[PDB]
Each structure stands twice: as C-alpha cells, then as structure tokens.
Write a protein that binds this ligand. Structure first.
Ligand SMILES: Nc1nc2c(ncn2[C@@H]2O[C@H](COP(=O)(O)OP(=O)(O)O)[C@@H](O)[C@H]2O)c(=O)[nH]1
Ligand SMILES: [Mg+2]
Length: 324
C-alpha cells in the first residue's frame, strides 16, 4: 500500500529530469539524555551504509576501556556509601589497586594486571550484591555487558566488535546531522544533542531510579502537543526494553507509578507505560502516536522498526516531502 501511495504522486513530472531528483525526509531525534538517540544514529550507518569497519571500530577501543573502568569504579565506590562488604576480604586490596592503576593514567587502558584486578572484583559476591542495587546510584547501562566479557576485551590484540561500539557511552554535544538513503528516500537525520517526522526515545529502564520517567513524560507532553509539529508524524520509541525486561522481574512499577495496580509483569507494566505516554496527546482525534518497543543496540530490531516507521512516513507525509 506504501508503494501504491508513492505511485500516485505526479510532481517529478514537473522537473526536467524528475526521475533523478531526490525526495527528502527531515527526521528529528528527541528524548532525554541517555535514552538511546545516538545509538539509533549508529544503527542507521550500520543498516543503510557500511556502518563500522574494523578500522573504525579500532578507534573506539580506549572508549570501551574507559567505560569499563568507570563502571567498576562506580560499583566499588557505591559499596562504601551503601555499606556493603567484600564477599572475600582479600578483594579490598584489589579495590585499592584499581584506584592505583586508574589514578596513574589519563585515558582508558587495559593491562593483564588491570584485567586481573577487575575480574576478581566483579566475581565477588559483595560486589555482585552492590551491582544488583544499581538503582540506588549512577552506573553505566553497559556495565554488565563489558564486565562479563572482560576476558575477550582484555586480550592484547583486541579489536572492538560492532556491538562493542553500539554499547559505548559517548556524550553528544552540539547538533549532529546524518544523511542516508532508504527506499529511495533521502533522510536528513538530526540528533539534537547538547520536520517530516520525530522519533522520541524513552529509556524504559529509568523507571525505578523529579522522577526520571516523569521528566521524560513532561518533555514528550510539550513536544507532542506543539503546534509546529501539527503535521509531523510523532514516533515514540519505548527503548531499553531488554533492560526493562530484566528489571521488572524484581523491581515494581509502583516505584515510578504509585497508583499502578496491575501485575508487575513485563506485559502489564510495559502496556501501562505506553498508555501513560500516549494519553498526553491533547488531540487524540486529530493526531496519532506511533509507538514501538525497541532495543536500540539490537541491529535486527531497529531495522524492523525503522522499516515500519518509513511506511508510516510514506503513507502520512510524502506530499510534504520536497524534491531536490
Ligand atoms: N541494553 C541497552 N542499552 C542501550 C539501549 N539503547 C541504548 N543503550 C545504551 O545506553 C547508553 C546511552 O545511549 P545513547 O545512544 O548514548 O543515548 P543519548 O544520550 O540519548 O544519545 C549507551 O551506552 C548505549 O549503548 C537499549 O535498548 N538496550
Ligand atoms: Mg547522544
């Protein structure tokens, strides 16, 4: 039906070489910090261009190291604040050596010695107990990913994989613009860090950490209901569904929504959140919100969701997309 929709247009006929003209789509990426905006951008390069070559991935190695060192130090420092002891008291020396090694370098690095110290600390029961209470302090979301894969990351000849790259946390400053072609549509994607359609990202896992989820709702409320976006397709990405899935097992939605009375399961809890956001639409009869549960780090899921998102654009906004 999208193909049929496109086929009705007659504007290329008005241009001398219309069949060679580029139909443009301006896409804005919005959402609170750390909600996954920049990961969506990487997935576009991976899916619609080449993405990350081994040479490109090599440039992210010290970032992978930096992220790994920050995660462990965060957990170790939290133990102090939360009064949690080491499972085996021999680790207290490793905790100190962690600070000695990190305190003597300027940027991320990895040595056999450092790798040894981190692996022993990570495997400790008191450290694991502190990890399981991460909702109480600031800890990188990719902490377990890198930490559990230390052995591979620690090898002298390590070359970061695409997943290693997608998992990195690199704060964005300034507005970042990316161009890619999908289904013959020329997308100009803006990651407003620091309009045909808008993709609003939400970190579902921020619910049990004003409350973060509520601040995200506040931002979506204003964005979604803004007059400038009256003719823009509003897409909602309820992201980090993989992390939310593991969290909802032991953490209750009531921490975020006290009035929530449904069962504390993935199905009911996720459904509740979607309804909370879509209900902010003050024009439920004139505007439709397009919601997708995503895992921005999963290339396959993002390719699927973006395919669906593109069909909505073709069916809803093609007439407002110019030829260049
Ligand atoms: N597990 C998991 N991590 C994610 C997901 N989306 C993003 N991340 C990670 O969360 C962090 C922040 O994402 P990022 O794209 O930097 O957020 P931004 O601040 O919105 O640009 C990065 O370490 C990502 O790798 C997701 O769906 N699942
Ligand atoms: Mg970013």
């Amino acid at each position: 039906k999208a193909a049929v929709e496109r086929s009705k247009m007659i504007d290329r006929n008005l241009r001398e070489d219309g069949e060679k003209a580029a139909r443009e789509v301006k896409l804005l990426l919005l959402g609170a910090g750390e909600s996954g905006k920049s990961t969506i951008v990487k997935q576009m390069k991976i899916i619609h261009e080449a993405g990350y070559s081994e040479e490109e991935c090599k440039q992210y190695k010290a970032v992978v190291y930096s992220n790994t060192i920050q995660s462990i130090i965060a957990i170790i420092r939290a133990m102090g604040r939360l009064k949690i002891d080491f499972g085996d008291a021999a680790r207290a020396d490793d905790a100190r050596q962690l600070f000695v090694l990190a305190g003597a370098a300027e940027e991320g690095f990895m040595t056999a010695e450092l790798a040894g110290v981190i692996k022993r600390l990570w495997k400790d029961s008191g450290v694991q107990a502190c990890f399981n209470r991460s909702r109480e302090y600031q800890l990188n979301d990719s902490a377990a990913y890198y930490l559990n894969d230390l052995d591979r990351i620690a090898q002298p000849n390590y070359i970061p994989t695409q997943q290693d790259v997608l998992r990195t946390r690199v704060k964005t400053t300034g507005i970042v613009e990316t161009h890619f072609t999908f289904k013959d549509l020329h997308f100009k994607m803006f990651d407003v860090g620091g309009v045909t359609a808008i993709i609003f990202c939400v970190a579902l896992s921020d619910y049990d950490l004003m409350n973060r989820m509520h601040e995200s709702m506040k931002l979506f409320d204003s964005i979604c209901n803004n007059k400038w976006f009256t003719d823009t397709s509003i897409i909602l990405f309820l992201n980090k569904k993989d992390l939310f899935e593991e969290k909802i097992k032991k953490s209750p939605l009531t921490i975020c929504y006290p009035e929530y009375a449904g069962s504390n399961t993935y199905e009911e809890a996720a459904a509740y959140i979607q309804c909370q956001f879509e209900d902010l639409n003050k024009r439920k009869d004139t505007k439709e919100i397009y919601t997708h549960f995503t895992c921005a780090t999963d290339t396959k899921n993002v390719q699927f969701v973006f395919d669906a998102v593109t069909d909505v654009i073709i069916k809803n906004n093609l007439k407002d997309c110019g030829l260049f």
